[PDB]
Amino acid sequence: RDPASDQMQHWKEQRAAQKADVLTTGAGNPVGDKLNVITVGPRGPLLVQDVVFTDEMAHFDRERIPERVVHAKGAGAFGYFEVTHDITKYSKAKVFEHIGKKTPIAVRFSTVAGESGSADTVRDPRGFAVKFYTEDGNWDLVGNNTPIFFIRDPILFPSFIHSQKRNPQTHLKDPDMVWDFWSLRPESLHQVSFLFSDRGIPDGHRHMNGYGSHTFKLVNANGEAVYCKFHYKTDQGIKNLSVEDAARLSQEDPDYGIRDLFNAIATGKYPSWTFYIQVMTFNQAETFPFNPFDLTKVWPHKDYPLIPVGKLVLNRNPVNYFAEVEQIAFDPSNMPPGIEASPDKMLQGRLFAYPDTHRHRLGPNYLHIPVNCPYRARVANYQRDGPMCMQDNQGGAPNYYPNSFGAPEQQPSALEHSIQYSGEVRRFNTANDDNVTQVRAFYVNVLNEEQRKRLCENIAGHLKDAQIFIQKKAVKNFTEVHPDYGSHIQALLDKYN
Amino acid sequence: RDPASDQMQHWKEQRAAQKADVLTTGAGNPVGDKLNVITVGPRGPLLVQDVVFTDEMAHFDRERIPERVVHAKGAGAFGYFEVTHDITKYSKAKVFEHIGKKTPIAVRFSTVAGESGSADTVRDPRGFAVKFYTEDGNWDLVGNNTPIFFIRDPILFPSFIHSQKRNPQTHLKDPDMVWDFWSLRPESLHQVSFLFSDRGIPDGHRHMNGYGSHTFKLVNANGEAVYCKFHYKTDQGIKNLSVEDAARLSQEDPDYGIRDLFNAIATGKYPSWTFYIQVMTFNQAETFPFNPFDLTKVWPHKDYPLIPVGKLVLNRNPVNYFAEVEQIAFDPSNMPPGIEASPDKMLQGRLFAYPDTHRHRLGPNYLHIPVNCPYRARVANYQRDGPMCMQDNQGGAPNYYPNSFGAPEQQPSALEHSIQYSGEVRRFNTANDDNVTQVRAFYVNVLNEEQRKRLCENIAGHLKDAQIFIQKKAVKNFTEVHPDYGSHIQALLDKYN
Amino acid sequence: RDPASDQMQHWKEQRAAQKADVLTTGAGNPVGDKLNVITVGPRGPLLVQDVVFTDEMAHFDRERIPERVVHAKGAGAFGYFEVTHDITKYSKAKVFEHIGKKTPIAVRFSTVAGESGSADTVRDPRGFAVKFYTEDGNWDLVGNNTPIFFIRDPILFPSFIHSQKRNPQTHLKDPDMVWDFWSLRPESLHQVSFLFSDRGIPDGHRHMNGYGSHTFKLVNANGEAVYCKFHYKTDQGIKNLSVEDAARLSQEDPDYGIRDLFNAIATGKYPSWTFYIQVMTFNQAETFPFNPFDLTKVWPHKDYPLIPVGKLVLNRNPVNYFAEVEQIAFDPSNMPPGIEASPDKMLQGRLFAYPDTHRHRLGPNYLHIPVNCPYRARVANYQRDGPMCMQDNQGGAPNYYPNSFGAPEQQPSALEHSIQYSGEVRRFNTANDDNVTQVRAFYVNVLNEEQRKRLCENIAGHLKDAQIFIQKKAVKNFTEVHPDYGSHIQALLDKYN
Amino acid sequence: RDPASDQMQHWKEQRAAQKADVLTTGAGNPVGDKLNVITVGPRGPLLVQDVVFTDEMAHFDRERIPERVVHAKGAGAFGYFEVTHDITKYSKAKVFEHIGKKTPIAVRFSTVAGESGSADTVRDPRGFAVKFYTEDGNWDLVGNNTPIFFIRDPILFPSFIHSQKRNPQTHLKDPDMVWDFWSLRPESLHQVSFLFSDRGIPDGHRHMNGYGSHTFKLVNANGEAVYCKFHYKTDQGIKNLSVEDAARLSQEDPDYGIRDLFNAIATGKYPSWTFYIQVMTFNQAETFPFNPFDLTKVWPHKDYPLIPVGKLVLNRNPVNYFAEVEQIAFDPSNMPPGIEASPDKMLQGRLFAYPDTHRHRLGPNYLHIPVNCPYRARVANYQRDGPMCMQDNQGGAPNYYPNSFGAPEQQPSALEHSIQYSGEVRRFNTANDDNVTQVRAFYVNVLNEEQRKRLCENIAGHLKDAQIFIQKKAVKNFTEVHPDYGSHIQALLDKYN
């Protein structure tokens, strides 16, 4: 059998030659018998003094935590990030200090819209989150398998996710909800085209690219700032499932990506990604034809070539899935000195959203969870007492700042990069921005004829379930991108009806 | 399209001729714009004074509650229970007072081992929980589609569920775990045979029986007590999917039972179940060949014929699934006067487990949730203040008992039925009880030859993935039930290997 | 006896002539007996089937919610706000629509630093929070009994509160912590002088003023904006306890303000406050000698006279304290159209802090708690499912925006007031701003000689416990305010040592 | 100054000669500046990218956990338990294995009815809880400063505590509630007499006795069982405050017992208690004049002399109060092999109540909190995944029992002691048991004349606030105990009226 199937037998074999441990309660008291309950004779009622029973049961009743509101179904792995090139001119980050420096990483792969228990091999954006345990605290690159997203304003994210998930009355997937949203929000055409292309259903997590997707800000030691996009492309090469194979695997193995990643790491075939960046100067940002902070746009490779930085290798599988993968938390706000946020509205919304949801899901002190702890750095601050505190709580150190007792002091070299912003403080409309230019480019330059045909059949297959007016609004947006794109979908829809 | 698909269009049509409501914050303040966020000009960072954003997002970040530790995937419906026969001689329950009395009910159907997002059409026991809103408080008949269960002691339940669910390292379904447990616990042969028969994969929730499974105690107005088993058999008739059809539906519609029940109720075809009981006297209980409180045994129909009581009709679909189906809580401890627990160890464990898990999942004041409230009864007690209290909290009434200020008094007619139990207070072993007699009866009397063949192929298909020694231990137990049963499985396993 | 003592007798008298209600479980099942537990004979162990016991106990074990991190000890009352003057030229708020309009209000009084169970009559700032149930959602004026605060940057608030509360090792009040913070942060001199004056220990909650303390922004229907300060001065007149009387009442009645407010409202003597505003134009704000948004400064009455608006009357006592006073939540972010935030940094920090802590303390759906609900307004939005949801959860309405099914639409008349802000986006230092001018004014103009002497003895009495260097740093700041102020404290400190 | 006041200066002195640590976020990222917030220029609104602010504030907003429903105000200390005598003939507990064996202990002192922030020096039962970190898991002796309690049935405990605490409408202490309960429940006369004697207000926590109060069951290695009462009497001697001194200290130092214990341990004067037991055989239990498991009765010293076991010394003060004292959890159910529960109904109720409330207060995994962990024992079991899991979660070990992979096995030597109980399973009334015999003994044998007078004045002082009929019912119960007791109270009450 595969290594995944032989988990229990491998556990037994690695612990052979030693006697079984004593079964205890949570409080360490030895259990006399855990197969029977205390009764008033053979056919009598259960006693309250059955403390072993009520402890076991009470813990069983409290096993479930809330699943992630998005990216619930997921797969986890560990390894390191190795620097291969010098980018110290761009960033002063300790993760990029010198060549050959290895930082430990934790990664989680996921499907955006699926719940815990949903099939792996389905058409959906794949999450690709990376947690770098840097000497200057944790760095969380929370990325996707696509360089763009559907929307460009963060106030629409809850709407988008509600449309992608189940109907609130029926509890069913509603193509009506999905295509109503997408047809009303035509800045999703670019991400929709990528999603309904061949790379919508990647063959596992080893054969997909990863992107930061956002513009980030690199600051060097001299204090100069540039703009960046992170790319981590697969070294195993891009590889996708057909719709038929994906549909078969959905019933055969709904845990295809968990099994694939576990077996790959267990057999020694460590998957690797090459870490690239694009650099954009402030003058180039001002003279960019589009908004360079627009999450629905990319930076073309001819104008902005990829600069290699290092490689990501995953070599260690999780010991316990719940402890290492279910409880891992990735905060985009976790950025070490040298890396900062850009004015990208979406990124600004993510800076709030993640720590908030982590406090709900995991709890106030979620950063004390081992996988979340910045173990390669020293944390000292005036943050004290909350629920489930599993440190000394910084002992008897003064808990106010400023003070006169040598408590932790602010480091002035870790200040943010200052910038002058123009305009009023109000709500600016971005719905009416360019929605079709880069989509047309992708359609008529990147895709070939058979790829265009498959893209159109995939869209038409999903969109046929929507109402007629929604089909018309969607096809109109596809026609505005390119007339062949719209006409081919319309022809297939007419066939389907 | 089917009624399920037209939820949104039906919502719009029923609310036609009125203008759209004003979009407000949670605090009722009108929202000026909810498509854009406040920035420092067109390409500026997000402001904290964007209260509309942070409210929306904060609520989105806290949408998920913990799924049920078991029976997570589920389907909900509402209707009534109509009394057709007089059983007042057996029970003094207000639910059974007089003929033609209608009590409102809430029902939830489920699969035991599947998570939220798992396929509906899979081989698993189906949950069939019924909440009767009686004048003497709520009655929760928390039943299954099988009259028995796998185990007879409640301390093994967490072990059983852990074996049925995912491996703690790999996060995969482990046939090794499933069949190791079942082979080591041979009192599961009866439930295993039922599960791997044709009724393992029922065609939706309308075409399955329901059983209390436990022995309950009926007390009449005179104070005499008897033993009972609740049966609710389908009026639509038993109907099952083939393995191939089930496997197809798993990828086609993972929400087959939700869709089926919604469409059935929406089109007017209300499903109905006929409520039966078996009665067992205390002398018959003492002279029963088996333990009558053993959850792995049934009461044979020749010795204990079914007595009709009434019918269960489901006529109303949930308005909002989360509010009515996700948040509904069924407590087996919720039993009105006339209905009591028997010495069945399993039932004794359920009396603790459910209210405990409900306090974790939903919260301390989960009985204030509308679907959980005993709205057809008046609650008055000395239970005060907890989190998320949404009543007057019983206003300024004295909060201690006894008192001298006319606070709620105990009703002496609602006392429990007293019984003398013999034997020591200790742990009695029940693993070595009869495990094969009723299993043999079922195999050679109920099943025909082609049903026996399908049963053997279904078991062999699942058990082939287990290690050789586990296969041998399982086949041994099947051989001890019946040699043809064991030999046929063994032949198929040898073919599979 | 006083009305407060006769709560139980009044309850009995108002419910005379009717029989006591039936004592039920939470699920509405009648309790047979609630004075004894089920045992295996007279001297036998307790049974698990004692469901009445375990329900009662389980609820008792979950009674406590987290106290407010600040303003834990508090007193609650209800009444109305009556408009007496027209300020429609300044604000378009429905609360100020027309003369004679009554809006229901909820008020909570409190002590900032005391825990639940601490003495009422102590030297501390008093909280004075007002919740207006306006037709345009709730308005929460979360004020103090002082027009200023200790600090002007919100990042120092957790430090300030930690210094005011107990030592993290000893769990004792530390004058060392208090005066170290205050001596290092000399912008607290103004609030410190007010706190150690006679109005530090008001005689109950009826004899104290209330202030918004922050600059707010009033917007009229025409779209013009001005700046505002809310004052609500007592109609019963300012009245204070001596240090000796306060010290006596601390042991005699630690619940002096709860008793005083309950008896005042119960006897019919309804306390009232007159609602005033100060108005500041944008040109006056630019030409103000100080920062007009500085929370340590006031607007002098000669330059900015008080403009009457209406009166606040409290006429109704809470029915249940836990439900109405412990669970009430005041969000400064809850502001109806016509009222907005100013650039005051402190106010900006409060816009985040309150809804965050409310989600922790009360829970995600704390706005469904009756006292927190905007019952005089209609809430409709795309916020769905969280823990302890006690509404229909907006039934089957579309849960995404924008949509094509007539779901709630944004109201363009409720947009925020736009303003152009100059300068870089960075951290600006405000520690080095004016700290002594208005403090000197207060000391030598408002206070008389005997008031100056009492102020100095109160400061010296508290500050004597601090270390010598902290005393010197504090006296230096007092000397920089005024040499007589510093010299008098120093003389008293030398006497104390 | 005293050691308690010099906590900060001692912290600075012990950390002299090293530079201050770097101030970091929770994620370990260095903070550039934590005195100012990011604004749009000097007088601009706060930015969302102020991640340092929102992290600090978010943690500050979640500092409070729920206080203990009882014994909220408390004081904590650490030390060891030294065995001085051999009781191996009575118990096989590892804590009592051999002479000179030191087990580490954690102790918490408390007042039953006071909230967090209430005065220490008040008339109330004092809690005296001891947590022994034994090699066979934790042992929690959760005791009081009195050998008895007010009630003998655990279903009345929530009523008793509600009566002792604040009125649900007024939020005030109600003598009406207190004396109504006590007058209706005359089995409280014994504990009431002890409480209103001189030992009602002990002088700190060092000058009070400690009692288990319950009958426990000692089992030896041979398998014979006896009954036990634990006594731990002070080596510093019993010492009490007068009513006047206590009333003074209530305003002067509400944290008198925290200060006293901190200074005592800090100066080196380690307080000590001598551990005694009483032994009662099963034949003596059957022939005892009273119920030997009655919590309102004691075992007289002439019939049952004290047997020395060892001494309890407290030598270490808590480093951080929140982490070590607020979060410490004591479970009476935590009993190592050799120590078991008796049929005492109260003890039976405590076996359920404590682990339930701990899951609410601290969380599901509260035993992972360092102070609660059984660090001197090895815990291995089939309890997995809950919120805030801070272990490996037992890695990849099989999570079901029984299994075939060498997972932890039950130890048959840790079985409970079996006993045959007679009688029906129902509710037996114990309200009508003897209530006055031992109370009379205490009154006329233990107390002298001036002690009797002070007892009567203390009762009369508290009871004067109750209504006339409650005074009459209370005095009647005191008269039934002894006519001089009742007549003296009545005379003082008549004087007070």
Ligand code: HEM
């Ligand atoms: C039916 C009887 C009783 C019930 C239901 C009960 C219940 C409780 C509860 C719920 C707590 C709060 C624990 C926490 O949340 O941390 C508690 C604390 C406490 N109880 Fe009891 N109790 C009972 C009887 C007694 C008796 C008889 C004693 C002493 C002889 C006692 C001593 C204490 C002490 C000392 C604490 C505080 C423990 C600590 O230091 O954290 N209780 N009890």
